[PDB]
Each structure stands twice: as C-alpha cells, then as structure tokens.
Design an enzyme around this catalytic site. Sequence first.
Site, PDB file in Angstrom:
ATOM      1  N   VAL A  34       0.943  -1.225   0.041  1.00 42.59           N
ATOM      2  CA  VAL A  34      -0.115   0.002  -0.099  1.00 42.59           C
ATOM      3  C   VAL A  34       0.869   1.396  -0.038  1.00 42.59           C
ATOM      4  O   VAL A  34       2.016   1.380   0.738  1.00 42.59           O
ATOM      5  CB  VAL A  34      -1.002   0.130   1.257  1.00 42.59           C
ATOM      6  CG1 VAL A  34      -1.584   1.372   1.220  1.00 42.59           C
ATOM      7  CG2 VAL A  34      -1.732  -1.243   1.414  1.00 42.59           C
ATOM      8  N   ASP A 145     -13.682 -12.767  10.392  1.00 45.68           N
ATOM      9  CA  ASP A 145     -12.532 -12.342  10.662  1.00 45.68           C
ATOM     10  C   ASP A 145     -11.902 -11.158  10.875  1.00 45.68           C
ATOM     11  O   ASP A 145     -10.822 -10.516  10.500  1.00 45.68           O
ATOM     12  CB  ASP A 145     -11.469 -13.004   9.450  1.00 45.68           C
ATOM     13  CG  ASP A 145      -9.969 -13.401   9.956  1.00 45.68           C
ATOM     14  OD1 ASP A 145      -9.794 -13.541  11.259  1.00 45.68           O
ATOM     15  OD2 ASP A 145      -9.072 -13.459   9.142  1.00 45.68           O
TER      16      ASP A 145
HETATM   17  C1  984 Z   1      -0.717   0.585   7.112  1.00 43.97           C
HETATM   18  C2  984 Z   1      -1.887   0.641   5.885  1.00 43.97           C
HETATM   19  C3  984 Z   1      -3.169   0.124   6.156  1.00 43.97           C
HETATM   20  N1  984 Z   1      -3.992  -0.278   5.038  1.00 43.97           N
HETATM   21  C4  984 Z   1      -3.860  -1.645   4.871  1.00 43.97           C
HETATM   22  C5  984 Z   1      -3.451  -2.659   5.267  1.00 43.97           C
HETATM   23  C6  984 Z   1      -4.284  -3.863   5.839  1.00 43.97           C
HETATM   24  C7  984 Z   1      -3.619  -4.980   6.281  1.00 43.97           C
HETATM   25  N2  984 Z   1      -2.651  -5.720   5.688  1.00 43.97           N
HETATM   26  C8  984 Z   1      -1.945  -6.609   6.345  1.00 43.97           C
HETATM   27  C9  984 Z   1      -1.563  -4.608   5.170  1.00 43.97           C
HETATM   28  C10 984 Z   1      -2.319  -3.602   4.388  1.00 43.97           C
HETATM   29  N3  984 Z   1      -4.557  -1.922   3.456  1.00 43.97           N
HETATM   30  C11 984 Z   1      -5.078  -0.613   3.040  1.00 43.97           C
HETATM   31  C12 984 Z   1      -5.926  -0.782   1.757  1.00 43.97           C
HETATM   32  C13 984 Z   1      -7.096  -1.632   1.506  1.00 43.97           C
HETATM   33  C14 984 Z   1      -7.876  -1.656   0.331  1.00 43.97           C
HETATM   34  C15 984 Z   1      -7.456  -0.559  -0.627  1.00 43.97           C
HETATM   35 CL1  984 Z   1      -8.655  -0.383  -2.080  1.00 43.97          CL
HETATM   36  C16 984 Z   1      -6.465   0.189  -0.313  1.00 43.97           C
HETATM   37 CL2  984 Z   1      -5.850   1.473  -1.546  1.00 43.97          CL
HETATM   38  C17 984 Z   1      -5.830   0.054   0.875  1.00 43.97           C
HETATM   39  C18 984 Z   1      -4.925   0.232   3.960  1.00 43.97           C
HETATM   40  C19 984 Z   1      -4.981   1.763   4.047  1.00 43.97           C
HETATM   41  C20 984 Z   1      -6.022   2.445   3.386  1.00 43.97           C
HETATM   42  C21 984 Z   1      -6.112   3.875   3.719  1.00 43.97           C
HETATM   43  N4  984 Z   1      -5.289   4.462   4.560  1.00 43.97           N
HETATM   44  C22 984 Z   1      -4.352   3.900   5.030  1.00 43.97           C
HETATM   45  N5  984 Z   1      -3.485   4.455   5.902  1.00 43.97           N
HETATM   46  C23 984 Z   1      -3.668   4.445   7.355  1.00 43.97           C
HETATM   47  C24 984 Z   1      -2.778   3.722   8.109  1.00 43.97           C
HETATM   48  C25 984 Z   1      -2.499   4.971   7.566  1.00 43.97           C
HETATM   49  N6  984 Z   1      -4.023   2.463   4.888  1.00 43.97           N
END
Ligand code: 984
Length: 344
Positions: A34, A145
Amino acid sequence: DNQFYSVEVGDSTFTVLKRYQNLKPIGSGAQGIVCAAYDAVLDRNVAIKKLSRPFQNQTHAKRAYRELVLMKCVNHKNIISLLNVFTPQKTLEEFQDVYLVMELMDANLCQVIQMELDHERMSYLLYQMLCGIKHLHSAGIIHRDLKPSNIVVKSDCTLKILDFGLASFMMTPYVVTRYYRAPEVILGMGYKENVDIWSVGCIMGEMVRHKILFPGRDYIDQWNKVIEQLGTPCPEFMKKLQPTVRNYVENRPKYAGLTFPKLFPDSLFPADSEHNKLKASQARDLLSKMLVIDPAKRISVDDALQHPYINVWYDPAEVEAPQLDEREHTIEEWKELIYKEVMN
Ligand SMILES: CCCn1c(C2CCN(C)CC2)nc(-c2ccc(Cl)c(Cl)c2)c1-c1ccnc(NC2CC2)n1
C-alpha cells in the site's frame, strides 16, 4: 504517450495512472503493498494498493475476486468503497497486476489501541464497527475474521472496515492473525451473524487492557487463554461440538473463569468523574455480553447497538441502508475471472 508511469517503491515497482502522484509506502502484506498518494484529478489524497499476480494461487485468487465482487454489494460509510481500480496491462495475456484505490485514511486500529481513549471516542469507534458489521450482515456477508489491522480511522474519529472476511495452503513468509476469531470459528462449528460480535469484544477489550486478550501460537494455546479467563463453556455448548473436538474440549481442564471486574479492573477506566464512572460500568457491561463463549447467549448486533454505552450515537440513517459464487478454479481460470471483473 502512456496514461501510466512507473515508480520504484522498495524492491517493488508501482505502474500507475499519471493522476496519482508523489507515492509513498505506508504498508505491506502477503496480499499486496500500500502507498499514499495525491490524486491530482480529485485534488484529494488517496491510498493505492497493488495486487501482484493475484491469480498466482487459489488463496490469493479467491480473496481478490471475492473482495472485487463484494465491494460492489456494499454501500456504507463504515465499509471500504473504491474510488478506482485499474490494470496497466492491456490484454488478458499480458495481465499481471491489479491496482486498487480508496480514500486515504490516517491510521489503523492497532495504533488507536496503543492510545488511551476517552469513552466518547471508544464508543463512537465501536458504534461504527457495529454499523458496518450490521451492513455486511444485511448483505448476506458474515465476516468472521475482523481484526484491528484491517480497520482504519481518520483524525476526526471516522472508521472503515477494509475487508470481507473468510469465504488453504500458501508459502508466504508470514502467518495469519487468529486472536480475534470466535469459539465457533476456532472449534469449527456452525455459526450465525453474532460470530462477529465476539471479534468486536476482543477489540474493545484490547482497547481497554492494551494487550491482546487471547494470544497464542495456535488454536490450542488460544483456546487455553479463552477458558482460563472466561471459564469452561456450559455443558450444552459442548453438544454443539463435533464428537472429536467435543472430546478434546470436554477433556480439557475445567476452569471457573474470572469475573469481568477482575478481567477489566477500574484502574483501566478513567474514574475522575461521575460521568466516567457510569460509562466505565456500562463498558464493562457490554464486554461481559460480547465476550460470551456460547453464541446462543452472546448479544447480537442489533442489541449491542441498543446497549446504553453505544446507543448515544444511534441514527436510523446509519443503521439501515442495504451473483452467487463458490467453487474453485485453476490459475488460468482465476486470471480470467479477475481480469473480467477489473475491466468490468
Ligand atoms: C498501514 C496501511 C493500512 N492499510 C492496509 C493494510 C491492511 C492489512 N494488511 C496486512 C496490510 C495493508 N490495507 C489498505 C488498503 C485496503 C484496500 C484498498 Cl482498495 C487500499 Cl487502496 C488500501 C490500507 C490503508 C488504506 C487507507 N489509508 C491507510 N492508511 C492508514 C494507516 C495510514 N491505509
């Protein structure tokens, strides 16, 4: 004159539409990477996730496809909604990666758990988890989950659940987090909508105690942590178990279990005012109703939304709003199935 451009992020390359600029790594996992970015067309910040060859095995494939399809079956502010989905590859033959785009959130729930929160924010967060879960249930989606790493928030306290839950083998360097799965998921039994209420209580309890309630290397350890704190399930609960599993749990040491005041002492709750003293009592009450091993006696989603601790935020507009796929396929079949979805 390509609509895309490539950027180096880690040992990985992100090929995205030119509208997305100033990419910055913010998270990774076994399903994708991401990045944060500025979307010059919407003049808004967004998060972009790359699924690299999601059709590589059944595990990745089933999830990517389900979630691509599910995101269309839901329309709620507390559930992830896509802003864009695209692939830089022009044909099915060339097809390799899928990019997903959504509104940029500020932090995940793990970070929030690490902080001390007032009752207003904790209950508002819990209320949102419940409204989202209720929405999924209304769409025939039982998550099973829910976990903090999959829930994101913003500074204004707004929340979004990011995935759709459970529907095998993988060689990923990292395992899955099971600490929030209900007894019924852990012991493989039938389940209903409130299987998700157990997960909400593991989260709420962690926000209070600031520690994972039921850790463990595996389901063996985990189950030991569950009974040592809540005690051995009632005899009837056992009749709901497979003869084999039942044998195992019925032949496990019998624990009395601790009371909720002991499990969640007052010290953990802000007792500097009558208001905070009443809210602490109400919180503990909800915990004791959610962390109930037997699903037959655990509070439901609708009743939890009606609990005094939560009810102060109730809003009909947010609580009510409102294809079939199952089997498995080969790599090739999955690749086409996902491509079609991506190209709509
Ligand atoms: C740390 C970033 C958090 N995050 C994750 C995580 C979920 C768990 N796995 C193990 C790792 C990635 N997936 C998305 C995510 C899921 C679906 C889509 Cl379509 C998109 Cl674009 C992003 C986003 C997120 C999303 C938005 N903002 C943030 N940031 C906040 C922590 C900063 N993270």
